[PDB]
Symmetry: C3
Subunit: 289 residues, 3 copies
Amino acid sequence: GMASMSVSTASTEMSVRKIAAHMKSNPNAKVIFMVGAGISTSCGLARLKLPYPEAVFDVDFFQSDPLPFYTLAKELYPGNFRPSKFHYLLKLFQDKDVLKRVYTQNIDTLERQAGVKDDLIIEAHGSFAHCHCIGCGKVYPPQVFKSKLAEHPIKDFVKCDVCGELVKPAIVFFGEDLPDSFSETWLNDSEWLREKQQPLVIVVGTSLAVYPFASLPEEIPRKVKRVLCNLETVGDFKANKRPTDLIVHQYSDEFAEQLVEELGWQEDFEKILTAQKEQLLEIVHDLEN
Amino acid sequence: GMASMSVSTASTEMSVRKIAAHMKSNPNAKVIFMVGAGISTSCGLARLKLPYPEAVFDVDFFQSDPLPFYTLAKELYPGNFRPSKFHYLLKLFQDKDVLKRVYTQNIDTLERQAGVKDDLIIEAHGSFAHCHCIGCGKVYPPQVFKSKLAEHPIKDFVKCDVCGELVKPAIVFFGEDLPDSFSETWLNDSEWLREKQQPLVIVVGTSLAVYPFASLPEEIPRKVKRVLCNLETVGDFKANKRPTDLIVHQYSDEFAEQLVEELGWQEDFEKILTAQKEQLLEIVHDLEN
Amino acid sequence: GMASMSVSTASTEMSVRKIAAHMKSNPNAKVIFMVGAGISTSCGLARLKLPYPEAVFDVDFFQSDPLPFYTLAKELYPGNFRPSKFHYLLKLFQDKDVLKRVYTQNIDTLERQAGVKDDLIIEAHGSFAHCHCIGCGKVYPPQVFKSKLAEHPIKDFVKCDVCGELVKPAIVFFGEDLPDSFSETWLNDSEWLREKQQPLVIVVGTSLAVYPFASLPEEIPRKVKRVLCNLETVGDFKANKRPTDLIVHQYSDEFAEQLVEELGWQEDFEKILTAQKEQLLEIVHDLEN
Ligand SMILES: [Cl-]
Ligand SMILES: [Cl-]
Ligand SMILES: [Cl-]
Ligand SMILES: [Zn+2]
Ligand SMILES: [Zn+2]
Ligand SMILES: [Zn+2]
């Protein structure tokens, strides 16, 4: 009940139990996830004078001098690493046909790496899937940019053959708008939520400091129960706490292990694990050393 | 004036003076109190493996295994202790016909122990006054349950002779709704406030972390002056501070002594004192040791 | 863009750059400033038993015993000190016809001292420009009060020859309403903002703990970009952060130097610098020693 006696943060064990409980008494109810750099943390010339630390990922700076981003770009492309237990929890949920969507701020493609269908993945912060012109918005295949990152140090920078403006991989920089699919799908899942109270929105592993993504939790219908799994209460869970909010100060991997145990899917999960600040600011941080 | 220059927290002395001031220039104006475990703190086999700490006070857990709550229940019933100075401040206010209501989350019956009329007491979290069935809601006299807590260790648990479901004392557990009188009376006092700005709502001794009780302060009419006497600014006083909010980082007993002194009721108060997290979580805490 | 990817606090360098950027792409767009004791900090019998620390600046206490305020009043009048670099930044902005208004809680007249036109200055907390009666509101020249502060220790206190009530300098005390010009002008600048999104509201050097001034930031039109330059995120920037808020944890003087550098006005600024809690609580603090 939304007016039944309850506690805000509570102990991890009770919170995880209440979540599983909610799912058990609400089968055929999908879950929407909203995740950040924290679900990939459990998996881990150089720098040459920048005006400010985040300039490499600033559309304005890039527009005037792309040499620094080009210099670091080679190290950014997604490798073929192993998804965390949490990422696999997303796959597990899909198998049980109970995963409505995953909204991610990460550009490591680890959710896709884990087997999550593209239809259920929303890369709010872009991806390397393609390149685009920062001028007209024209799209190009990944090769165009990846190509230049092989030609000696550099002869020149890829440019739009229609407007002349610079071209870069489709990862959203500070100063750019996010892809249409983001706001458009959220609007769709948003009304979906409104239609159904049996759904859940689980926000995990993000300090909710990057906008507009950080506005998603406050827009969750006040009638839909929201969960936060983060080492600290952040964003809207801190500023505008709701009687039904469930906060779990736990690591995403442990959280995944405990939720699976409570749902009684340990076997299906173990099978999957067997057979099969935000990332940009983190990188910016490492640069400054 | 609600637009006169003022300070949020201010010094204890000025805050207490402003409160007395408000009462002196607003006689025939009752006060509503909202209190927690903090007004009884100034007055102070065992445990056997629980899934989570708060399970003993969780309606769900109880529903499947009441043995642990039965084991601790004997130690919970209200003894005949001495009410704190703050509790007596409530009695003092009643005598002066200036106490509209006391909303309490405590189950120690200390406000009633101090002489506060039942009509002015709202035990939002229940009491041992009676027992009820967690199934149909049927009510039974205290004896039914207290009886079983005398029969050897235990032969079986009290059950509803109409639905068969478990019976327990009327103290609200996590997962249960609060008694009708709570929301119903708050609605009444709420409109009462709306009708009158001469009233005051003083919230004392609670971290405002237990819901729905923790929603009372935000629902106080924005036009009614609210006071918080707590060692820390919490809940809505922290999240949505109002220009007229008065915060007093003081202990409830000291606060009572100082307010009485400022009002000039030391004698009536001394006469009364002469002649005559929340509690559940606190207990849960002690269990874990 | 208000929906373009962005960070809340960000690094000082990027924040200052974005502000200058906003101004460069928004010329003919004035700026409104809201400032506190923090822009004058970079420039630096006795006490005789008070009920509470802030009593000297409390209209109620003053009404019953003005002797303490009279005793300290002599030390309060504005001297002819040198305005800080930040104050001169205000003058600089005026010269560039890009300063719409300065709302200040300070009573040191340093903004006027720096050359800011009175038309653009709003002393929300009063000034020594004149005296007034705390009874009828009658105004008197500064001399009336300053006069008594020369007559031996004291023979009596200045009083209103129309209502008999006490007269004092026009600096707003705790318990008094602010001058009409404050709310009236804010209403004017408020609609002005609504009319224009090219303006900016920069809040600098205040913990936003004194009301009603502390209500200005939340009333800034949600469609107008607001900046906070303070060593700590406070007030509405903390409680109700907005996607477009820009926070700069920097000292006001450094902030001024950096903004000027980014705008490219170093010369005009250097020329000006060449040729040419809140203050009341701070004083109250020093009293207690
Ligand atoms: Cl569906
Ligand atoms: Cl009444
Ligand atoms: Cl104008
Ligand atoms: Zn183009
Ligand atoms: Zn029953
Ligand atoms: Zn007068």
